[PDB]
Design a protein around this ligand. Structure first.
Ligand SMILES: Cc1sc(-c2ccncc2)c(C2=CCC(C)(C)CC2)c1[C@H](OC(C)(C)C)C(=O)O
Ligand SMILES: Cc1sc(-c2ccncc2)c(C2=CCC(C)(C)CC2)c1[C@H](OC(C)(C)C)C(=O)O
Ligand SMILES: [Mg+2]
Ligand SMILES: [Mg+2]
Ligand SMILES: [Mg+2]
Ligand SMILES: [Mg+2]
Ligand SMILES: [Mg+2]
Ligand SMILES: [Mg+2]
Ligand SMILES: [Mg+2]
Ligand SMILES: [Mg+2]
Lengths: 131, 131
């Protein structure tokens, strides 16, 4: 179903990568964040909801969505309540970039553009059909 | 035409807002960035290209795309070479948030979801049709 996303944090090189997966397509977004924090999750969610129609969000760590600030973001935006593959692509490009955050965006790009239709094409097709 | 984006920086409250417009739909993305810099433009471009099919990018300040690091990002991603409306929406929500960056994402959300089909619906329809 087209408005369902999955959100989780992973660790790499002593930093935090917030990864969101659009479950029906496999499309991803990701950001290196300074801390695993309510404020960062909330700000991420706000940015995601403005780009895509985010109806419902699932996670593998329910306590992630417990903060008042996360709930306030989901309230405002109308939201209700791959780590291994991405790390693989990160590992392949890591040496091409200085910053981990740059490697992550390179891996996100590679992941979404790859013919597995790419995940980037599938999300758009899924969402459009749904309108 | 569906792969064409417009990119520019504006100023508000002594900070820099990078704004990208998907020209065919009016859909926007935006980020408050610490400095008007080649590195920030390049990193933004990398994040945008991974989410949407960005073929060509236009700007109102050509010297923005002059840095070696911007060119390297456009090279890697295969890219070739509203400020008033957004500021208006920012002004309407500003008092609801502490951080300007949060107000900007709220304004982006409002702008893309508004029935003017919303710009968020139009980009997806435009891009899907094109596949
Ligand atoms: C801090 C730098 S300098 C630089 C660069 C400069 C000149 N020519 C190639 C790469 C780069 C790039 C590396 C790979 C790329 C495909 C994202 C393009 C730009 C970066 C890059 O950080 C950015 C994206 C500028 C914040 C990095 O983490 O290495
Ligand atoms: C630093 C804070 S605390 C906080 C908040 C906390 C509790 N209840 C409502 C709002 C908020 C929120 C304000 C508006 C919102 C719709 C984005 C939801 C969360 C923020 C917010 O910064 C964030 C998004 C957490 C980095 C802000 O700039 O004011
Ligand atoms: Mg969705
Ligand atoms: Mg998690
Ligand atoms: Mg957006
Ligand atoms: Mg990143
Ligand atoms: Mg496009
Ligand atoms: Mg400009
Ligand atoms: Mg993406
Ligand atoms: Mg912002």
């Amino acid at each position: 179903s087209p408005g369902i996303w999955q959100l989780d944090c992973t660790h790499l090189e002593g930093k935090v990568i917030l990864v969101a997966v659009h479950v029906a397509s496999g499309y991803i977004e990701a950001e290196v964040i300074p801390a695993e924090t309510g404020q960062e999750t909330a700000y991420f969610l706000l940015k995601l909801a403005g780009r895509w129609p985010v109806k419902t969000v699932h996670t593998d760590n329910g306590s992630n969505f417990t903060s008042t600030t996360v709930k306030a973001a989901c309230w405002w935006a109308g939201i209700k309540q791959m780590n291994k593959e991405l790390k693989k692509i990160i590992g392949q490009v890591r040496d091409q970039a200085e910053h981990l955050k740059t490697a992550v965006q390179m891996a996100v790009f590679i992941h979404n553009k790859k013919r597995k239709y790419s995940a980037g094409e599938r999300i758009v097709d899924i969402i459009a059909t749904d309108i």
